[PDB]
Design a protein around this ligand. Structure first.
Ligand SMILES: [Zn+2]
Ligand SMILES: [Zn+2]
Lengths: 88, 237, 61, 50
RNA sequence: CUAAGCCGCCCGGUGGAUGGCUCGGCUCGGGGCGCCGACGAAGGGCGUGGCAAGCUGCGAUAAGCCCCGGCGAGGCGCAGGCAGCCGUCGAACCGGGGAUUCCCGAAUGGGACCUCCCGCGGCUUAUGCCGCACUCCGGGGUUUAUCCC
RNA sequence: CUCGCGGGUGAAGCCGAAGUCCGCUGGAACGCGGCGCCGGAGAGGGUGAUAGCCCCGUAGGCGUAAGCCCGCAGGGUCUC
RNA sequence: ACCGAUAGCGAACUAGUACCGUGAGGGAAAGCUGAAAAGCACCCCGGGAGGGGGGUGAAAAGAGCCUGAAACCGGGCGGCG
RNA sequence: ACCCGAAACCGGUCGAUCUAGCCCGGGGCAGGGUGAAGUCCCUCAACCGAGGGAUGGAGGCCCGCUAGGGGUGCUGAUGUGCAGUUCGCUCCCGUGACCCCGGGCUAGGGGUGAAAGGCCAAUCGAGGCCGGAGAUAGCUGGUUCCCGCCGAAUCAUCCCG
RNA sequence: GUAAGGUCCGGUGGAGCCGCCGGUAUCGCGGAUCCUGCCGGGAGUAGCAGCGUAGUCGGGUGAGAAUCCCGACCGCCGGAGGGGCCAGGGUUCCACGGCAAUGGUCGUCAGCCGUGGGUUAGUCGGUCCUAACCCCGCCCGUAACUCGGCGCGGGGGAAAGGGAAACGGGUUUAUAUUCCCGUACCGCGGGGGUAGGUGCGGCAACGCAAGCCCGGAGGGUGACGCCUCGGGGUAGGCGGACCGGCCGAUGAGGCCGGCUAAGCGUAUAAGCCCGGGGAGUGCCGUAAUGGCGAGAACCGGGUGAAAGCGCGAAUGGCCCCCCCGUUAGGGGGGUUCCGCCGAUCCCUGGGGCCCGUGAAAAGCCCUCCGGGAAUUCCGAUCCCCCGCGACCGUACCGAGAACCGACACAGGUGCCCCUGGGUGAGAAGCCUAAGGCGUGUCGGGGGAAACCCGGCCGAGGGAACUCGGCAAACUGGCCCCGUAACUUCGGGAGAAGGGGUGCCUGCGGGUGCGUAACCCGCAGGUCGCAGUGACUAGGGGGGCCCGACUGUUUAAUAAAAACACAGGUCCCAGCUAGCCCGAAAGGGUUUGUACUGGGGCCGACGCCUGCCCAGUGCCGGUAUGUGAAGCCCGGGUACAACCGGGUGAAGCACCGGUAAACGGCGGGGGUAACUAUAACCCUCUUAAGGUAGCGAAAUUCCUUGUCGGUUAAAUGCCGACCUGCAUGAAUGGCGUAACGAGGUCCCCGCUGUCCCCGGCCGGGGCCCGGCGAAACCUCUGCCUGGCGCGCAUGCCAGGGACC
RNA sequence: GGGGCCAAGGGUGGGGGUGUUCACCCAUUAAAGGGGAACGUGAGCUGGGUUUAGACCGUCGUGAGACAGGUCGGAUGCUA
RNA sequence: AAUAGGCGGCCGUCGAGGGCUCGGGUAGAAGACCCGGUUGAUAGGGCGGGGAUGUAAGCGGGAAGGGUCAACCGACCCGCUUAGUCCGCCGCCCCUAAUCGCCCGAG
């Protein structure tokens, strides 16, 4: 294989073609799941994908429909409560 | 003759240069104009391990929006609030001018002159003791045991540097020493002048003994100051 | 070692390549200057009176 | 070798075009005086300047 | 009428000395002539001939293009060939004046692990043309940025 | 200084005398023997041998655009 | 009153060329047919390269080309063996 | 200064594709064994305790012709070699102070050195290229035609002689 | 002509040359291990072996065939000699036409010669980002610069890091992810609709098409170490059924084919959440660690990978059959299931380790702030359609012939990435399938020797060989019993030592739904000399020296007792410090701050580390003497030079500390004669006289010291004594488990090391056909006794000798 | 047994420590002789000692270092 | 053996004798040497003798056991079987090849 494909950042898969040939398919690894900005636990409603896969989706299919989608529900509720109590 | 390791170090070659790109950054105080006459409150975001510091570092975000790196004192807690200024309370992790620090207190990261950013008591596990306070100077006992006078406006942090007791455990392995010294690019392993050649060291020779007394004068030229330099005495007392 | 087996490791990047100014294959590619005319290190040509190559170029020696 | 810059490729092209024998009509015109030129090359024995 | 072998002469081979030749060197009193370049130099790279590889000459108008003058019938470089073409409306050649003159190169709008690439402002319908390096001098304007002309 | 005029110089370049007579040798006469000529030209070279007279040239003369120099004439400035 | 192709400049010639070294840099060898190509038409042999006849030229000077020395090699002759 | 020969000294430049060190970014090491910390379980007793059974995978750990790296002995083959340091058998490391690759930096009285005066392009007790330079020597070698006439010396004094 | 030489005759040659006088000069060669060119003997000899020993038969082509081509047979590699592809090479790639030269022989062949060709991209890579680092401008230094440099501004820097988008089939002699066909995707721009501007479902986690344009901020992703384990999946492999084909005996059985890309749609696992619920004389769970009123069991749900499934897609590919077959062609069939294993290839979670913390930026997604346009209007991240997408690389080898090493070099670069079946723990060895090759390229002959290299065997003895058991030999895998001194308690240890091992018949057990797969036992029968039968595959033990260990070193005669190491201890330094580079400017340590930076020595660990500061060093003081210039005072000079004196820093003189600073640690007489001989003892003597230990030592000259053990025999080895020529405590002393291709002695076993050598095999040697050198060479080449520059093939006298 | 004469045809061996020649010792034996041949014999072998380059100990030297003082390792080319 | 010998026989003043070629070793690195060559047992082949291993393939039977206690499988054992295989040793038999041909040679 090429030296560029000898790197382990590529995923190698052996695939049999309909014509009976054996070929190697190379793919790039997916990014890891998003994490909360305050506690670091995994988030929900945000699909994992490379930039092309992310741009293949509409806006509402990438983040949950609730305030502060960058925080997990516990942190979001906590921040809302602190803001409300600070206002009074 | 040939050069010594100390002579070759002064030329700044990559064999002797510090790898100051894998470190977290310099640890200096915020500029003195913010601290003078005003007290700033910050929150500790994270505590990390600086590759070469011998002490953990911490990130502090201040209310004015400035993010800074500080030397974490022992017992510093993530998410806690700290204060810097003349009106700061006397607690671990708070920075105050030396005039407002009561006698008998443990301090670290003391500015040599007001506003330099901190120069003294920065290694892990070290602290200094405030001895006396005067309108013109403040006396502190340093880790080396010397009593030093500082300007009353010099800033210091209350507490003890985290990471003490590091020398309690032996290094055991040459591999452990290799990793420890490679982390900061210190010359390791080290050779011996007696086993060097005569062309290389003042002590070099076929017989592995120093041909002259090992106490060298303070007035010796470069390339000669080896062994015990300007030693007041030698041996075990 | 140090001989025939050593000479087998000459398959890396060449030290010198062609120079755009003087046309000779003397351009230090890694450092970025010409070892013959000084291109990339000086605006003026690299001429030394102990050297006879520039005279040889025009048969003036 | 697989990846080549255009300028180096053009220089190699010039060398390849240079490497050829003297025309028979040139030999006839010169009356067996001009038989060869100093730019003849064998790819495995005499290497290029670049 | 001795097999190998040895010395001398003759013939032949191998080799390239000697001799003769010389469009090349070397050295000189005297005489002549002595700077080129941002109106882009010198040095290079690459192309260019019907058959063309090297040298030489030229630059996409590419062993060449135009104009006044000299010569007067051949000419198409070194370079003895094939086929053709140019010339009496004066060629080839020669003195003078013009046109073209790719890329790199002080290289100069910005970059070079490859003499190859990537831009911004005006005009231009578009093709396309011009301007844009740095350190200064004499001036103008304003945004007073040492920014624009 | 030249709206003007005259001259000198100044490229390629042009002119520039006299045997190619008889016999011999020779593949081929520039050679040999005989008879002639020019010459301010018998320096040198080429030409199928070694040539003053075969050719180029040489001794001596001529011409030349641009440019340069000098002068005439006229118009100005300055100095004592 | 210089040299005459191992000389004279390194280069009389496709010479600062071919070629050597990563690089500064280093750097050769190589001139001559004949007046005129008139550069051998045709025949025999050979797979060819070439060989033998026959032609051109005053002379092969035959392109592997002016003269062709010495060393060396093959044959013939004289002497020894 | 009749001709050739030194080791060496000095100036300016060229080299880290070999090799030494360090930095940035990468690739790799079949299979098996042993069994540290840690976490426990069961039985008989209970004032003490004793015995048995598991799990766990650490190590500059072990065996290893995996790959890769190294080079102890035969003082083996070869030794005008396959090779200006190679081949075979035997042997050693083989998860680590490990091996290798691309991009960089350190240049000569200087670099680099787990220190052998080792390594710095087949060159190292001071690299290479050109220049000073045709350097110098009381030391070694060489010095080209013929005839004719005469024809020595290696002994005294002085010289770092 | 004494001669250096001159001149004639015969032949070749085809164009210049000479006598004499007078000048001039790169003016005369056998040597310089001289220089350049050419040519001899060695020689038709060596080499064309060793690490992979490969060819034979029939046919074809051609003038010519061991060497070129086809078929069969026989072989080699097969975790690489196979497949892919960098750097480097640059046409070596393809076809046709050829053999003057090249190819270790030949050649009709070729990586060779000639003539014509060949590299096609919006998707692959460069191009973009930044890392270590580099350059330019200002500035500063330098006599100056093309030289050195901090700080500011700008730029560059990866063809294996980050990074938009394509995958099947077909086509050419040579290109294809690039050409053709089919089906897609990405970026920009445009046209028509729609969602939204002005919309909903869930308690919630969340599900949703969920407004457009400009600017800014925040979050996420990009984005990361090492060790180790569980879960899910896919390539690949195995067994069985069935349909075609081949082989086999048209028996049994074996073998071959039975295939499915991107893209689009589709969802669960772990992990993390969200509602309900309210436990402990505790429940729950994992391979393991573990979780719970800071909310567990338990019942529901949300989000969330690799994959699978459907379309793509059977008109394609594969296999088989038939008709036409003079060339050229045309059609018909099938391509289906079950079970098991399972990756080093993907996804996903735990756990553990760091005095070690294992990149940045471009880009992309989301959210939030301000600003702008929009109502017979604005308008998408949703659907349909249309247009555009630049420049450069693309052939080939990729190496026991296409790279570097002068080569078709057994080296190095690149083994850089990948691997069917059996045996087996195994990517081991051996055999074999696919793929490749017979080009790690000179062939033929032979009891055709001697001898050499590589290999096998050897009666009796068993190290008698030798400096030395060098080399060789013994043992060997697995299972079960068993295992010493010593010890740092971890080890030593696979110590040592003992028994078993094949095949067949039949049962039992573990996990498992399984009579699938793997593994572990039992009983009986039986064969051989031998059952890990080939292959693979430790010999072992006891003393001593040195070094603690793993590791490093003289590339090319030394791998070690040398270096390094963790540990011990000493010295300097509070920062504008200490140490260091430089001509300076500036700089390294330093994005550092005494648990730190720099400088010596010893060198794990255990017990210890005694005396001496007179000397040489270093440090502190310096009352006092000396002590340069400068300054002051007097003399001198119409002014100076010059002379005398005073002041006089550092440094020396002087005084004190300092030995884990350099070093040192002596020497004579007599005794206590309950013999003789020892220190208790008294006299010079220095700074003090060597303490604990160890000692004929890697240190001992005499020396093979003396005594004891080892042998029949001991210049050895071990133990002891002390007369230590010339041991000794951090240039460390003594001891020491484990470790070692280090030196050394012994024991069992073993053997061709030896007594004492003898057989056999393969390759050379030898002969025949080819290519075809080099080292070296004054000419030559028999001896005895002699002379001689003192050891003669060559001289003298003899002797002998065909080539 | 001791001493001597003629006589050189033949024999004159195997082992332990040590690099050893030599010397010493052991068991046999008729005896276990001394020497020359470039201290015969490395284009025949081996490489233990000696005598380079690495390293340790002792002594000497201020030091670099040295020791006919010990000690471990340290290359043997060939086509007649 | 340089005094380079003696004797018997055959040949010459076309020709005695010999070499290459042929089948094989009492021999051998090339040369050389020795036996045989139709005046024949030299080698091959056929047959027989002697020897070396150790009882072939095939068939029939048995076999610890299994199996629907049937068919059938089964390591191994017994009989045909001093077997089978092989012989770089010997004897007999002209069936095959030892043929054809070329060359030197004193006068
Ligand atoms: Zn959160
Ligand atoms: Zn240049």
């Amino acid at each position: 294989m090429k030296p560029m494909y000898r790197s382990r950042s590529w995923r190698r898969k052996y695939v049999r073609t309909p014509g009976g040939r054996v070929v190697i398919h190379f793919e790039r690894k997916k990014p890891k799941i998003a994490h909360c900005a305050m506690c670091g636990r995994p988030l929900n409603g945000i699909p994992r994908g490379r930039p092309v896969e992310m741009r293949k989706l509409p806006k509402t299919k990438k983040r949950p429909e609730r305030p502060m989608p960058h925080l997990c529900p516990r942190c979001m509720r906590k921040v809302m409560k602190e803001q409300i109590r600070a206002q009074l | 003759g040939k050069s010594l390791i100390q002579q070759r170090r002064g030329k700044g070659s990559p064999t002797f240069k510090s790898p100051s790109h894998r470190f977290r950054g310099a640890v200096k105080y915020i500029p003195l104009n913010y601290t003078q006459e005003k007290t700033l409150r910050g929150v500790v975001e994270e505590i990390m391990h600086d590759p070469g510091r011998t002490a953990p570092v911490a990130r502090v975000k201040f209310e004015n929006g400035i993010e800074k790196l500080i030397i974490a004192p022992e017992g510093l807690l993530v998410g806690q609030e700290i204060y810097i200024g003349p009106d700061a309370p006397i607690a671990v992790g708070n920075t105050l001018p030396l005039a407002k620090i009561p006698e008998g207190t443990y301090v670290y990261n003391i500015e040599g002159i007001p506003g330099d950013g901190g120069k003294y008591v920065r290694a892990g596990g070290t602290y200094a003791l405030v001895v006396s306070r005067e309108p013109d100077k403040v006396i502190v006992q340093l880790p080396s045991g010397e009593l030093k006078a500082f300007n009353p406006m010099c800033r210091a942090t209350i507490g003890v540097v985290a990471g003490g007791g590091r020398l309690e455990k032996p290094l055991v392995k040459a591999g452990k020493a290799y990793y420890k010294y490679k982390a900061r690019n210190k010359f390791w392993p080290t050779p011996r002048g007696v086993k060097m050649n005569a062309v290389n060291h003042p002590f070099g020779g076929k017989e592995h003994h120093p041909g002259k007394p090992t106490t060298t004068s303070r007035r010796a030229p470069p390339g000669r100051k080896v062994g015990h330099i300007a030693a007041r005495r030698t041996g075990r007392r | 070692g140090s001989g025939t087996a050593t000479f087998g490791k000459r398959n890396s990047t060449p030290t010198h390549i062609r120079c755009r100014r003087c046309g000779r294959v003397s351009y230090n590619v890694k450092k970025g200057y010409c070892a013959a005319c000084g291109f990339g290190r000086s605006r003026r040509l690299r001429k030394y009176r102990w050297s006879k190559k520039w005279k040889k170029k025009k048969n003036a020696h | 070798a697989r990846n080549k810059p255009l300028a180096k490729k053009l220089r190699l092209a010039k060398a390849l075009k240079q490497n050829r024998r003297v025309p028979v009509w040139v030999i006839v015109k010169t009356n067996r005086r001009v038989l060869t030129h100093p730019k003849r090359r064998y790819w495995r024995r005499t290497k290029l300047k670049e």
